[PDB]
Structure 1
Amino acid sequence: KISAKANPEADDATEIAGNIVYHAKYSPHFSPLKFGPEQALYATAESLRDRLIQLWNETYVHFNKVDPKQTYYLSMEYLQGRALTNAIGNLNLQGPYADALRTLGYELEEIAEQEKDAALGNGGLGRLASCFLDSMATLNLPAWGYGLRYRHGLFKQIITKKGQEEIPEDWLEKFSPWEIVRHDVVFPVRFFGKVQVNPDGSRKWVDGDVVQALAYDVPIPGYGTKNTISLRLWEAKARAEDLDLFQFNEGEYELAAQLHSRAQQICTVLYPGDATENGKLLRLKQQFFLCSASLQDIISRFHERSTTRKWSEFPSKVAVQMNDTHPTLAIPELMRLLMDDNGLGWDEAWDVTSKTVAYTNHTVLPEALEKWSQSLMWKLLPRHMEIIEEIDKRFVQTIRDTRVDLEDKISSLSILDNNPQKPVVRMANLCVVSSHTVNGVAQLHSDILKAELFADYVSIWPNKFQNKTNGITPRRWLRFCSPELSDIITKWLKTDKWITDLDLLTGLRQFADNEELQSEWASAKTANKKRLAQYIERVTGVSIDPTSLFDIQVKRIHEYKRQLMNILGVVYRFKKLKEMKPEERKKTVPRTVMIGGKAFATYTNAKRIVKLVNDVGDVVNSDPEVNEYLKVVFVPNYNVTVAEMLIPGSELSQHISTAGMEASGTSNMKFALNGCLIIGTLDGANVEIREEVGEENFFLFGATADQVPRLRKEREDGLFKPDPRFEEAKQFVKSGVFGSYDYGPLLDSLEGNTGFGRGDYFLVGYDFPSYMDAQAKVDEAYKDRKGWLKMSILSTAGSGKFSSDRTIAQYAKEIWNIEACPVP
């Protein structure tokens, strides 16, 4: 019926349908006869990519001409999610694309559901990086991300009757229609080898292995702007020359291909397991490979913008941001590139380096900061060790010169820990010593950093440390995932400028009590809940009641996130329902509980928690007697797509980490922004949300951070007195009512008073009573519909501050010193 007709700039239904069909025909990846959903997606995605290329190229040419200071963000993860809807939306072509697909016999949703998530990351570190990219593009900032092109991600989670099983991700097994290979953009990265000392006394890293880094671009479109930036990803490749024919033809296939294998290894998965020496080396290879490829690419661009250049311009034209310690090696690597490849002296090269690099810490934990064996570092990266050692030797001399009062502390301040048992390189110390700025990711976290963790460094450089509170993008996380709700907002604010000025959401406050608005809000939530119900049946075969309360905990499965507390809470509520007469049951609040997330494969108890949730759900959900009032579901393969289906339908979300353990929590913000109320500890980003939405719209409970040490010491000393409901939940789990699986060894982590891996270190038992009492409040509040709806609107109305646009603007001004560079 419809005719192929290329129109790379199509912007109406007919043009778009012609261009989609053009790509179906003349960019084929399949037999021509069938044009089913999958072929439609790739066709549509190529239609959009025509737009994206035009804009990316314009933006590249513009930054080239203006030669502004440019920021480059280094991260080991990016959670890009699906790109289709975000691209349609930033190009403001929703109506036209939807019409185009219908003329081709498809609903956009249908096609959207075919797309795979780019498995390029894992946690909030990666989603932060991605929301930042969106904000850089929309604020017209000259900034890019650089990452690694992982083939298989961390893993795809399957749920079998044995619990979580891990299988590789396949998002590249056919092809990805977003990315643009650049076969001219290749840089060599070395490993192992040694340092040649030249007769003139210059130095050179030689020998070892050389791999090739190949650039692919993923364009990132901004909202209401031509500016389209890049997430540039690196693939490690061997050259064809590196296959040894002689050995292949001798039948020795692994030796023959061993350079190709070492390359493949680097982009196989995120965070490869590192109990062994091999894995530790592979991790370091990953980190180095990203730093070295990216910095060579950055230096190459610095020179390309020359209009004949002097190095002293470098930190006025470049800013590099290290996200956690993973890209620490950018420090010595930049030093290597300056002194060896470009001939600079130490002092000049260090001045440049120190003013270019800045460091973002995301961790409350003292021992979670990366430390590497000095022995491994010498083996893998000998030139970098020389440089790292000279950095430490000068810094220690500074402390003897300028600060004799810290002499006794040199053995913890220095970068090199020369402990005779486990000598290591302390990477956070290298970051802090070298960067012009260090920031944390929430006001409390940043204060802990200045006061406890990095106290003495704050002392030497009192202007080095800063705060930059995390945020989210309101495009992906409200405008695009919750379009019904966004229309309501635009109607009642009488503008749509909130989509780039999120503080305008405070205008909703005056309407929180308004009956018509609450009625509209109920309907949108009800409609988003039907959809979520649908999805849940589709992906777990469980039929959930849309009129019940939707209570959601989705995040990495970890003892400190206290999924176990949640799930024991559920066991308790279930027991009490079985024990009630039917007349008492009709008075409780029906609830559907939803838990999701992934456990590290080797993390035994995390894997036992996932198993537990499922076993509970099998029994609870199939009990005709109480399944009207309670259901429990494990949502599998939690990722961006899943979050996009859960958040708009959520009513209560649980952010209940042990106080002091979380530096932030951006999912918190997504929930708050979509009118979902929180039950939470006064921890991380909960502190800021609760300030912004108001205490009365938030279910606080649990010990506070300053209290926790004291409460552990009470446990060590036999003074802890457990609540009987806590013990009743445990026993009931041990009674074997949830099947043959012995949960005793899991529950053992909550027994005893002292010793590694027991003694309830995360205060599950202790917070259970105030947790369950906050849950009773949530039940009472939910029965008062007007009050509930009021709280939900004030939740959204207070979410202004949590925009990634605010965060990036702050970074741009105080740290990077970059400014808007709009493409005409």
Structure 2
Amino acid sequence: QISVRGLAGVENVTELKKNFNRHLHFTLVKDRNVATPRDYYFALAHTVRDHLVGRWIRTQQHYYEKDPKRIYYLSLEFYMGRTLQNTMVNLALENACDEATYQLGLDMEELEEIEEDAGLGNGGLGRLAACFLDSMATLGLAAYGYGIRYEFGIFNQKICGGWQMEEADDWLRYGNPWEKARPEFTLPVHFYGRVEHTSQGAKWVDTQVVLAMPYDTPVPGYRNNVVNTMRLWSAKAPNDFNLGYIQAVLDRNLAENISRVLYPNDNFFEGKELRLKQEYFVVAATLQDIIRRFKSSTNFDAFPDKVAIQLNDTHPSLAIPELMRVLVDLERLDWDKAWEVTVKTCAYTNHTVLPEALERWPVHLLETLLPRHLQIIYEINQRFLNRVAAAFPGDVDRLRRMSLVEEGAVKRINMAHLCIAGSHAVNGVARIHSEILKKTIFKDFYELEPHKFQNKTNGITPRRWLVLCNPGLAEIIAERIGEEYISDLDQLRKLLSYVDDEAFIRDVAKVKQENKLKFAAYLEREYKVHINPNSLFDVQVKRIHEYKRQLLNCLHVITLYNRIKKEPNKFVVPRTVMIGGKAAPGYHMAKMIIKLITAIGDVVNHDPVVGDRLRVIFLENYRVSLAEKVIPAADLSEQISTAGTEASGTGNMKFMLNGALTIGTMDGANVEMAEEAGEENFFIFGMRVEDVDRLDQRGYNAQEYYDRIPELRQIIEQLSSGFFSPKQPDLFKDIVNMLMHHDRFKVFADYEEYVKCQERVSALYKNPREWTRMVIRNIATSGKFSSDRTIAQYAREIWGVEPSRQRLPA
């Protein structure tokens, strides 16, 4: 149908058809008379998977032969989403598969909807890991993603009576055709035990053993025949575990629980023993695999020339002391040599400055679970502080601040300090964030070792986030500038030559309109909700958090409602306000925010005076597959975190690529997006980081805003008095109390500027030609936010390897 989906040649189509029928019969053991759509989805998935296999085998062979430097990306989260469409796009099979299925009487788009998301992450951090794998394969890097194969990924969200309920995400129920179990490469991981000091060094003895069994998933690059590996570990008890008899067998679950469930917290640290087990499990299995592969290619001096380990936040920080353990206790290197190797091998990416998200493990947990690692951490700390003392003599407070060990009621290990000490590179994830790291929380470390500190601004893959989710936009772009932009997104700048072209303006607006109609129908079909597709689609999708300020959006929505009720016969630009996202199950305030959003909807959506001028919809079960549907449909992207709190953001970049304008604060990557597009093409409002600091110095008093802004006072009185909860008048008192007395994120302080900025948005939306011209200016300057750019920078500036766009032979 469309050019960017590839060729549908007669021989290709014939072969796909016969292999589809082969898999239905032999693999699924069904005849066509009782096959369901799910059976047809599996038969297609197996057919497409067969095309990956030859390339996967050849790619891994090529790495064994050439022996390039290997990149190991360690993460507790890989938020992959669905695989079928992405695989077809990357192998140029989409049009052929569409045709093959069409000729068999099937609708491929319907089959695609049957696939479960692989939901092995919480949000941005996990999704970044997934985008990075796609870019590393596309850039020809010998890269491996290592993680945990959780049996249960991020929970499915149901809304009941306006409240979030959680259900287990049993994503493997029907099988996962993309993975290959490799039980032959199972490795042991040790826990508990004690340390014995012999004459030939330390020995970690009397341990409990859990086995780590790997499952491998192919990661195809874009049209280059490179297929890399994501290796995910699953926990298995040994066969003599606990070995009355029946109970001993049932108690194997105690070991296997390590890989059972993803911790469902976004940007928050929960210091539970099971989480610590997960972190060590992934590190210990991965490092054995790395060392095996290195030995099969005695002399560890070359280790950093052949291996890079990238730590995705501090979650895999135990890699540092584990590498030291292996090199010192098992390989018998002297400490100084081992430390040199470790530092040159490891690099640390920080993704947050919120204090509640920083990992600080109690010493007593590490002492019991990982006694040798604790000894190694203490030794690292002593040697590190000896360097600090020599550089800054007499500065005793600096020694306390920089210590890996935090004093207090409970002594804790600061994992970020460990990562900085043991890594040759430390980066933040947007320019403003990397500057904040150097000026505030890691200032001391920067003064000691300025050379370590870098920036690598985040990005998103344009394969999933343009070609896959918005083929109509990809096509109209390709008609003008060709297809090369898909792996070289900077070529979108060429679109600035079309900003005055009437045909292009029309086509851009037409694609948005089609995406809106398609999303409005999806809503009606799957959720029985009716929306006006001529309205401005105002969208805030992201995890529910105080710092992300869904509450500020709520205040604007109520302001609009109150303005309509005051002057009902005045024209206002119609809006559909859509908010979606999961709350962590234990995060009470986030759960209350969801309830407020649905409660506002219950009033606004049923007021006959409002009509179709304002609708408030809570989008249930926000996840990667839903992002792919809603983001192409959005007109306005809400990126409204308090300045200094969102390290980068990546949803922001997805919306920019897909033809939404952005209303946002100067936070995270929003700063760089505005710089690329021009501030005149962005709806910037609110306090900058410097203004937040000035307010904190004099003291934030929310009462002052309440006293001075009548529209704000009215909303608080409505919340307090039960206007949005007539049967439970005090339902929102915790929200009111927080806003008035304990608001760390200064919602009221940005309210006036936010409302005024929203009025400018509405004014521009009234002039569709100028709205669309501004959109073109945003899409055209979005090239910097390709994860291909991000990964090329990591490769050159951190890993010491050169990217390549050259194809392997087919």
- What's the TM-score bracket when you normalise by the shorter of the two chains? over 0.9
Q: Tell me whether 1:429 sits opposite 2:378 in the alignment.
A: no
Candidates 711, 715, 724, aligned match of 1:738: 724
Q: 1:628 to 1:285 in 2, by over 3 A?
A: same
Q: Tell me whether 1:636 sits opposite 2:620 in the alignment.
A: yes
Shift of 1:572: 2.0
Candidates 518, 522, 539, aligned match of 1:531: 518
Shift of 1:619: 2.9
Q: 1:485 corresponds to which residue?
A: 473
Q: What secondary structure sits across from 1:57 in the alignment?
A: helix
Q: 1:617 to 1:236 in 2, by over 3 A?
A: same
Please give the per-residue CA displacement for 1:593-621, whole angstroms capped at 9, x wherever unaligned.
Answer: 10000011111111111111112223322
Q: What secondary structure sits across from 2:219 in the alignment?
A: strand
Shift of 1:527: 0.5
Instruction: Say which is worse superposed, 589-598 or 357-366, in terms of deviation.
Output: 357-366
Q: 2:669 corresponds to which residue?
A: 685
Cα separation, 1, equivalents of 2:656 and 2:264:
34
Please give the per-residue CA displacement for 1:313-372, whole angstroms capped at 9, x wherever unaligned.
Answer: 111000000011111100011111112222222122111111100000011224531111
Shift of 1:162: 4.6
Cα separation, 2, equivalents of 1:580 and 1:237:
66
Residues 361 and 439 of structure 1 are in contact (CA less than 8 Å); yes or no, is this contact kept in structure 2? yes
Shift of 1:11: 6.9
Q: 1:797 to 1:445 in 2, by over 3 A?
A: same
Cα separation, 1, equivalents of 2:789 and 2:644:
25
Q: 1:337 to 1:508 in 2, by over 3 A?
A: same
Cα separation, 1, equivalents of 2:429 and 2:25:
48
Cα separation, 2, equivalents of 1:734 and 1:10:
68
Residues 536 and 635 of structure 1 are in contact (CA less than 8 Å); yes or no, is this contact kept in structure 2? no
Cα separation, 2, equivalents of 1:278 and 1:610:
22
Shift of 1:217: 0.8
Residues 242 and 257 of structure 1 are in contact (CA less than 8 Å); yes or no, is this contact kept in structure 2? no
Shift of 1:226: 0.9
Residues 716 and 736 of structure 2 are in contact (CA less than 8 Å); yes or no, is this contact kept in structure 1? no
Q: What secondary structure sits across from 1:560 in the alignment?
A: coil
How high is the TM-score relative to the length of structure 2? 0.95
Candidates 706, 723, 727, aligned match of 2:709: 723
Q: What secondary structure sits across from 2:573 in the alignment?
A: coil
Shift of 1:408: 3.2
Q: 1:365 to 1:737 in 2, by over 3 A?
A: closer
Cα separation, 1, equivalents of 2:573 and 2:51:
50
Q: What secondary structure sits across from 1:818 in the alignment?
A: coil
Cα separation, 2, equivalents of 1:718 and 1:640:
40
Q: Tell me whether 1:302 sits opposite 2:294 in the alignment.
A: yes
Amino acid at match of 1:694: G
Please give the per-residue CA displacement for 1:564-584, whole angstroms capped at 9, x wherever unaligned.
Answer: 1111211221222233343x1
Residues 722 and 765 of structure 1 are in contact (CA less than 8 Å); yes or no, is this contact kept in structure 2? no
Candidates 680, 699, 705, aligned match of 1:696: 680
Amino acid at match of 1:360: T
Amino acid at match of 2:395: L
Amino acid at match of 1:270: L
Q: 2:764 corresponds to which residue?
A: 781
Shift of 1:740: 3.8
Amino acid at match of 2:581: G
Candidates 336, 350, 353, aligned match of 1:361: 350
Candidates 234, 245, 248, aligned match of 1:247: 245
Q: What secondary structure sits across from 1:544 in the alignment?
A: coil
Q: 1:752 to 1:168 in 2, by over 3 A?
A: closer
Shift of 1:56: 1.1
Q: What secondary structure sits across from 2:675 in the alignment?
A: helix
Shift of 1:380: 0.3
Shift of 1:395: 1.0
Amino acid at match of 2:650: T
Q: 1:807 corresponds to which residue?
A: 790
Cα separation, 1, equivalents of 2:11 and 2:208:
49
Residues 215 and 233 of structure 1 are in contact (CA less than 8 Å); yes or no, is this contact kept in structure 2? yes
Amino acid at match of 2:19: N
Residues 11 and 93 of structure 1 are in contact (CA less than 8 Å); yes or no, is this contact kept in structure 2? no
Q: 1:329 corresponds to which residue?
A: 318
Q: 1:716 to 1:788 in 2, by over 3 A?
A: closer
Q: 1:570 corresponds to which residue?
A: 557
Q: 1:269 corresponds to which residue?
A: 261
Q: 1:664 corresponds to which residue?
A: 648
Q: 1:717 to 1:212 in 2, by over 3 A?
A: closer
Amino acid at match of 2:724: F
Candidates 387, 394, 414, aligned match of 2:376: 387
Cα separation, 1, equivalents of 2:582 and 2:739:
29
Q: 1:650 to 1:694 in 2, by over 3 A?
A: same
Please give the per-residue CA displacement for 1:246-291, whole angstroms capped at 9, x wherever unaligned.
Answer: 331xxxx3x5432x212332112222689xx997111100000010
Shift of 1:422: 1.9
Amino acid at match of 2:619: V
Please give the per-residue CA displacement for 1:394-438, whole angstroms capped at 9, x wherever unaligned.
Answer: 11222233431534311111111233x121111100000110010
Cα separation, 1, equivalents of 2:414 and 2:352:
15
Cα separation, 1, equivalents of 2:226 and 2:594:
43
Q: 2:5 corresponds to which residue?
A: none
Residues 86 and 468 of structure 2 are in contact (CA less than 8 Å); yes or no, is this contact kept in structure 1? yes
Candidates 359, 362, 378, aligned match of 2:367: 378
Q: 2:166 corresponds to which residue?
A: 166
Residues 119 and 151 of structure 1 are in contact (CA less than 8 Å); yes or no, is this contact kept in structure 2? no
Shift of 1:209: 1.4
Cα separation, 1, equivalents of 2:275 and 2:633:
38
Q: 1:318 to 1:11 in 2, by over 3 A?
A: farther
Q: 1:13 to 1:115 in 2, by over 3 A?
A: same
Q: 1:701 to 1:134 in 2, by over 3 A?
A: same
Residues 162 and 598 of structure 2 are in contact (CA less than 8 Å); yes or no, is this contact kept in structure 1? no
Cα separation, 2, equivalents of 1:70 and 1:555:
33
- 1:390-539 pair list within 5 angstroms: 390-419=379-408, 421-493=409-481, 495-539=482-526
Q: 1:553 corresponds to which residue?
A: 540
Instruction: Say which is worse superposed, 587-596 or 33-42, in terms of deviation.
Output: 33-42
Amino acid at match of 1:132: F
Q: What secondary structure sits across from 2:186 in the alignment?
A: strand
Residues 546 and 745 of structure 2 are in contact (CA less than 8 Å); yes or no, is this contact kept in structure 1? yes
Q: What secondary structure sits across from 1:190 in the alignment?
A: strand
Cα separation, 2, equivalents of 1:727 and 1:475:
47
Q: Tell me whether 1:50 sits opposite 2:38 in the alignment.
A: no
Q: 1:4 corresponds to which residue?
A: none
Amino acid at match of 1:257: L
Residues 442 and 468 of structure 1 are in contact (CA less than 8 Å); yes or no, is this contact kept in structure 2? yes
Q: What secondary structure sits across from 1:377 in the alignment?
A: helix
Shift of 1:95: 1.1
Please give the per-residue CA displacement for 1:701-741, whole angstroms capped at 9, x wherever unaligned.
Answer: 11111111332434359755441111212223344343446
Q: What secondary structure sits across from 2:357 in the alignment?
A: coil
Residues 264 and 584 of structure 2 are in contact (CA less than 8 Å); yes or no, is this contact kept in structure 1? no
Cα separation, 2, equivalents of 1:691 and 1:744:
45
Residues 716 and 753 of structure 1 are in contact (CA less than 8 Å); yes or no, is this contact kept in structure 2? no
How high is the TM-score relative to the length of structure 1? 0.93
Q: 2:250 corresponds to which residue?
A: 257
Q: What secondary structure sits across from 2:233 in the alignment?
A: strand
Q: 1:719 to 1:573 in 2, by over 3 A?
A: closer
Cα separation, 1, equivalents of 2:249 and 2:739:
56
Shift of 1:658: 0.9
Q: 1:802 to 1:273 in 2, by over 3 A?
A: closer
Q: 1:237 to 1:32 in 2, by over 3 A?
A: farther
Residues 20 and 44 of structure 2 are in contact (CA less than 8 Å); yes or no, is this contact kept in structure 1? yes
Q: 1:280 to 1:701 in 2, by over 3 A?
A: same
Cα separation, 2, equivalents of 1:719 and 1:685:
31
Q: 2:3 corresponds to which residue?
A: none
Q: How many percent identity over aligned positions?
A: 47
Amino acid at match of 2:761: V
Residues 70 and 818 of structure 1 are in contact (CA less than 8 Å); yes or no, is this contact kept in structure 2? no
Q: What secondary structure sits across from 2:593 in the alignment?
A: helix
Cα separation, 1, equivalents of 2:800 and 2:265:
38
Candidates 768, 793, 816, aligned match of 2:776: 793
RMSD (Å), alpha carbons: 2.1
Cα separation, 2, equivalents of 1:483 and 1:440:
32
